[model samples]
Target chain A: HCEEHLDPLSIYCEQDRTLVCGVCASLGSHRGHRLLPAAEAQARLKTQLPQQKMQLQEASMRKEKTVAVLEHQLVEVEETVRQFRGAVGEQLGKMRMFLAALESSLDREAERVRGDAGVALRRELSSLNSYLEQLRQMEKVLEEVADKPQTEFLMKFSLVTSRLQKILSESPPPIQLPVISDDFKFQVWKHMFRHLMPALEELTFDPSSAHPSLVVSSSGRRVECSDQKAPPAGEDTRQFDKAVAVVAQQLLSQGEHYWEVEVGDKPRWALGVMAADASRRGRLHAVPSQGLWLLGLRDGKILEAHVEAKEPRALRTPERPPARIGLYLSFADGVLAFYDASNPDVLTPIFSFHERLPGPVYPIFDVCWHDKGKNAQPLLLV
Target chain B: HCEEHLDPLSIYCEQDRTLVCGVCASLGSHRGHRLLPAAEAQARLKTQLPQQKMQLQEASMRKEKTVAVLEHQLVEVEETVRQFRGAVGEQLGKMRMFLAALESSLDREAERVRGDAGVALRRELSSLNSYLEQLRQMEKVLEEVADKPQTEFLMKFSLVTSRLQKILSESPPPARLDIQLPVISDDFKFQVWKHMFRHLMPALEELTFDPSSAHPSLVVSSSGRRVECSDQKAPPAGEDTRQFDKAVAVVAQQLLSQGEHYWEVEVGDKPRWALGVMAADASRRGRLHAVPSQGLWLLGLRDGKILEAHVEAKEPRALRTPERPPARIGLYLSFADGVLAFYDASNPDVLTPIFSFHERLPGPVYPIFDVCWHDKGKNAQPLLLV
Candidate 1:
């Protein structure tokens, strides 16, 4: 019948032991070399120990539970590496005291902006060395008027001391008056001799208006309009009409009456006047070949008037041209020119001269002109 | 004199009466006491124990030369395990005869390519059952013209037999025309609707041109251009003015123009134009009002003697402004737009519209236009400003 009703807990032999079936324990014998039929010896030990004793007792209990789970994961990775080495040593000691207080406040703001830019460059080089020692004491009184026999007033005060030393040594930074302040350097030194002393006394009576009005007058040459004036001592016709309107407003405001002037015996001095706007409107016999005349006097007549030019050309032997006379004014490049007072080879060009002017178009900046009709026309009164 | 030549290697242990300084060799009576050296350990161990046993008989004479170098490395490790088990039993008998001849030639080349693709799918299901019996005898003559009387020509031949049964069931995969002829599973067949009915029957007779030289029709219904074409059929007047001047001179010599037609009636054709200038014509006007008028001409004729209008602008509109009056009349955008026209606020824009011509303004692609002509003026040419 069902294999002899054997059920001693279905014979397992608890893994290993000499056999005994028929429900073991019935005199469990070493039944002839370890009995058989316990289901044919558990099917010949389940085909030769198939589960190898439950894989050697589950590999010895999984090698003691894998060495106790690798010793509790090596003590939780050594307590998370000792709490990240104490949080990286307290964030490297607060970033080394915030990088040493940001390098000592950037080295005290770069030494206080380099000591305030070296005290603003030592007070602008001590106010440009006290205005270059007052232009060297006005160039030693203009070299004591350089031995004055009035050689045209010592060649116009030695040409205004070599043209203000060639304009303060070619102006590299010379607009100095404490770097431009003290009330615009006291209005540029009270209009600097009302604009350089009537162009240095008309280039000391004219050394050709000393390169355009750096004046010189007492006549050894230049002062044109036929130079002679310095006489009329007393009639006082309103001081000879205010000395012919202050020598025709400083020789027509120094565009100087061309050149050549000699006039000696003081006949109401201060000559040269060219820069004509029709020589201040007395219409000097309608002249204008090569304009810009000046040197005024009129009453005692030692003239040189006309003015403005440019507009003639077209000649080609127009009867051998030239004689369209009327001249006297000068000043170069910074405009105002004129020539051919008597055929000095017809030059021209007129106004718009530059060297600092916002007004003075001849006797126009506070005008005052009077010719008294010596006729090279001269009247103008603003 | 150097501490009197310090000599102290002593030992005199006759059992236990000790006097041993020779590093007290295991004391307690010097174990097996023998050395008695205070000086020369009593004649070197009773005369070097037979001269150190004659140097152990000369090291047993190098043990037969170290056993002949360990029997010549055990005969080269037993001839490398007998030539590594004879090359693993001759590669396991040549991999069991190459896996039984690669599983019997991969099951006889997969049953000879599955019996040559099942006898070419039973000769393409018997030539698709004789082309579905000639499309069911042309759908039983389009259901016998669905009771004729031109119910709009039997509803356009029953909408071309329901779009030829949805374009022959979306035909594709077919043409591998066996050059040298070998895959003969009863002469296979699957002609993808016979090559799309030979290019869709000339793109549907170039979309049936007529209704005046307005050569550009297209109003695919959603009902708008108040359908009238005066009940159609007016061709031959110089054949639509010489085919609308030869389709605007083939869109000015193939700058572009595309296909798809068949507003049915017998052979209401014109389906495949596909002229040139297409290679991605610069992403052929994509987004923006999302219209492509695909290769131009969808529905037009505002002046060609008015037909059922519709020259595009269904959902269009976006052209994004910045001046685009359909980009100066030669519209653009094509890349085969697969349907999506809508506009119908009483015909604001019928089915599909978009003409375009003068080579759509000098090529080099870009071309979006249709944004209500931006700062207005400059893209003239309405016949060079009349």
Candidate 2:
């Protein structure tokens, strides 16, 4: 029924997207609206069901895809938190064990030192007792010689004097021991800090800030120069137009931020920080004056730092070239230090810049041309 | 046979502890020395062998014992070094893992932010398209309406005008955002160190009790060298001090400044007691939650039968002596080195470390003692000091 009118529903009001009786359609709310037979309208609307359902399915899929990715991230990060806490627990646990063992070692060493000294003292005491015994034996013989017989006195005289004189001339050895160091505790504590590297930021490449010839991995943690140039960026107006370079998405402006880049044996590459407003156009030369402070490897071996106002300054070549380099940026301290972090336990300083800089900067990586694919390794962020 | 002397050996020099011939005994180095027949003197000297052997055996045992201890310590330390290095490797390995995960998380967050923004932008596009579709349909119908056979033209115009007017009156919702993160800092090591060191690894402060923090029921000697739990009249509250109410524990007067220190306490058969360092700012009044988590690093005795490290929040690492508990204990605190160690120092030159706390202790920690009263004074032995 068309409830208000008390008439059976017989017509469809397409304009109102409703059903109505003849009375309602002819003279009520649906009077001026487009109308059709209910059966015919149902048939027409039913055809839209699949298309609308398909649209809903597509929307749901996108939601599921996003959630799927998010779920993966959540689980991984959760696992990481679990792992790190366990790692911390184990590290400290072993530290305690090590301390206990060290204490035992030291105590034993002390005991040995004492025992060795005791042995020396005892040896001297035993020698003195033996010599005294020898002198007492002579005295007994000398007492027996008193007016008993001249033969007894004369015969015993030479041997007694020889033994007595020999015993009298000997000197006792000195007591000595190896001195134990009192600073092993300090050494171990220092060693712990040596391995305990400063916490550094984890960075990722921003494709929007990369050159057309550079490719940033999907995870954004790795970047390399590629032969297949990417399509012009929608944000291309801000990208490096010439250099096959990329800047991290994170900007350094507050606190001390440290990060490392794994260059591995890439013979030719440039790495450092660029002023937020540094020129990104063609043929950029890295220099402090140009707001780009960087280190570069050229012709396969030369390592140099960008000069402040002059030509590049050559740097010492480490025993082995670093596979990974670290940078520490302390805005408050106005310091930026570079280190060879390839050796996990050893943080060898490569260079340091101390002048306070302007407001903000971006960590940049320049993967020069692939050299016919010979130097195509990606620089990874850690 | 005597090669040094042509005369066959015929006598034994008892006083000289050597062999001799009749010729030498009568006139040479053996003359006038206690002399005896060769067989009798040899038997007499040989009789000392077992006694000397026993002496040598005892001496050998001591040497072996000392060396065995040294060897055991060497092996254990070697093992500890191995364990610690592995632990360091794993800790940093996981740190790297954590860094990797953090980067991935941030990247994903950025991706989601972009994705969400894209979805919003797309929804707006869809809404505009849906509206435009109606407009297109109306335009199509309007074009058809002219052929209207006149009937359709007038009917469609009113409806079309009404729908367009309503649609035009509504406004669209607004939206805008600018996006940003890091896993850590350049002082990253130092920063990570604060948390990780709290997660990872001193001086003996020679300590004396501060009467202010002691419970009225406990007696702290004038020298602050001894504290005995007693059933004395309780001091009224509001005595204007950090006086502990229910707890028998007391903090030392000495503020443990930076550097190394050592102190000794004579337990002397205390049936129940707690000794170690506690955070100065920790709650000193009422029943205390005594443990490392609660700022107390104590090794306690229960009925003088069992020793325990009050380490965890709830679990205690129980300890036992090979025989009787140590009468004297030594505490070593190295604030600068971040170390606190306990040792059995009954013997001045000997140290048997009971425990070493490697984890960082935070805040101002003071030497503390809990001379517990049980069976109402049966366990009231004092914690004495040298």
Candidate 3:
């Protein structure tokens, strides 16, 4: 209702931006303007409100879902860190106990050796002294009989002769010292590895270095080829320009690293180690000489990259292309091995490469374009 | 005084071997006999009696000293044997304890390795399961978006794109198994020697009598400490060699190998005996023929005469006065110096050299003893160990 018209306003002015009475709109300044009935405008706004509210609610729910995912990831990361600390602590504690036992055992061994030697030495000294006393008594008897008459001397001679022969034969024995040659350092380190090697971190890919045609996830843990290129251009110099590939953020100059990638049903893909500078040229030959140590699969056939090879070397795997691949790098040992990690518990080895790395290396992954949109499944880092 | 003449009856007669009255010896039986006056006979007998009594007392004292020495040696040997047994027992006990500790530690190490691997594997499995669940959810979201209308599809495309990227990037981490390699056996054996080598038997002179060399009458103790004459004759050929056909003798079991060796022997009251080193192949067919020529270096005694047997000379020469026979004789054979020496080992510091041979010894020889039946009453005692 309009107070100025003394009637209820039944129309809404479009350009003038006011509500008016039907009588006023025709008779007054609102007649030339586009208008709608007030009830109609109200109905139209009402119709749009539920859809907008639904969209806003959906946006909020999506945001909340992202928060939940982030919170879950935080908890998992914290748990992993705690487990790493606990494992290391437990191992070190056991090592300390083992070392203590070793030290005490060695001490007791040394004490026993010394005690045995001391006891034997004392016994030998006692035995030698007894023989000397008996010899003196025989000489005294012989001296007394020497001046006696022939008859008397003949009678005593047998006794003296018996004494003389006995003294000629006892010897003292020799003793050898004990020697200890245990190498404790070598043993301790050997046991240390049983605790140390399992604690290496799980790696993730670098999204900044992903190709424009590859869709890298926000978590930097997965990548796949998209039919359409990304809207924004990547400014990272380490980005792959020509190849459909991405490299992990972790550099492997020393120590050990392990990570798994889910390949699913992709028809073609490549994954392995690569030199840090291998992808700087925008395009790489994907061979050992180009600092790439990769295993590739094409049309159900597996191939290994070699130095200066005209084509990738074909390999006959034990099974079909695995749904998941595991890459293990022991940089210090100069060895890299791959496994089929699709089945959680049973990881089967597919191939191994034994070569000295030229320098620091990084994990590289590629999902090659094949069969138009058939192989668009992303390679997931697990 | 003589009862018949009222004088002391102290006249002595060597031929008659009796003491008689001076008057009686001259008047009654003094026709053509040798006799001395009472006082002179008394002085002479008195002088001889004391010297003989002194000699007898000296012999008895010497025998007593030998008994004392043997008794003392027995105590020392028993003590040493006891100590040796105790030391070995203690060492073995400690070794057992150490081995037990080693076994337990190894067990614990194995258990820890297994435990750590198990824990890590379980954690990895849990993580993998969580990832799979996330992947399933993302896949469901994609399926839902795919079924939408064009307008709805355009609106949900961003959501699906984000979910697809998340599922593709996330993956399960790999688990590494733990391995252990403990050098227990070699290390434990090496450490055991650190205790064992110190307790190994001291390299002592081990003397055993040769069965073939023993005379029928000789009884050699299993301990090789005493040798006495047996009352019985040789029962058979295997009973112990020829009986009365040979003198009572025995040779040591151990041969003289390389390096200088010294040992002592107690030739107690046996009056007639020989001790020397003889070749294992020396002739035992003839008694006197087993001389230096047959690779035997001997020093023997008979009737107070010290005899040195040689191929060129076979004579017994009397030792000078006061050159007493040693009760304990030490034989030192220096193979490197090509000499064999005998010493009276009783005086402790003074190794009184009785004899020395410069002749080059043959490869291996053994200590030998020969006991003859002279003054059987005195020589019946066995050779004792001091």
By TM-score, the best candidate is 2
Candidate ranking under lDDT, highest first, comes to 2, 3, 1
**After superposition, candidate 2 runs with Cα above 4 Å error:** A1-382, B1-9, B12-36, B43-51, B82-122, B146-386
**Residue-wise C-alpha lDDT for candidate 2, range A1-382, written one tens digit per residue:** 5567788676878777666789888886989989998667656754544553354345445545544554455345445544544544444444444445545655566556556655654565566556456545655654454345433333454455455446445523322332322234334444444444445687779987788778778598888887664576544546887777888888889766678888888888888888987668778878787788888888767889886756889998877677888887788767777888787645767888887788599898888888777888888887
The candidates' interface RMSDs, in order, read 54.1, 12.8, 15.0
lDDT of 1 by residue, B1-386 (tens): 11222434255554343344544544443647664543453343235335433533343343334445545544554454445444434423332343345335444554454445445544544544454454455555545554554223322543554555564554434534232212211001112112212221112222222223222321122222111112233343253322232132112212233432222111011111111222224222222222234433233222212322223466422222222122112122322332212121111111123323222322232111111111122311121100
Cα lDDT for residue A77, model 2?
Answer: 47
Candidate closer to the true structure by TM-score (higher is better), 2 or 3:
2
Query: Which residues of candidate 1, in runs, are more than 4 Å off?
Result: A1-54, A65-120, A127-129, A132-382, B1-386
Model 3 superposed RMSD (Cα):
38.5
TM-score of each: 0.14, 0.33, 0.26
Over the true interface, candidate 2 deviates by an RMSD, in Å, of 12.8
Give one digit per residue, the lDDT tens place, for model 2 in B25-121.
Answer: 8897987777887567646644754654464455445444555554565555455544544444454444344444544654566556555555554
> Cα miss at B169, model 3 (Å)?
72
Q: Please provide, for model 1 over A215-244, each residue's C-alpha lDDT reduced to its tens digit, 9 standing for 90 to 100.
A: 233343222232234333343221222323
Model 1 TM-score, 2 decimals: 0.14
Arrange candidates by TM-score, descending. Answer: 2, 3, 1
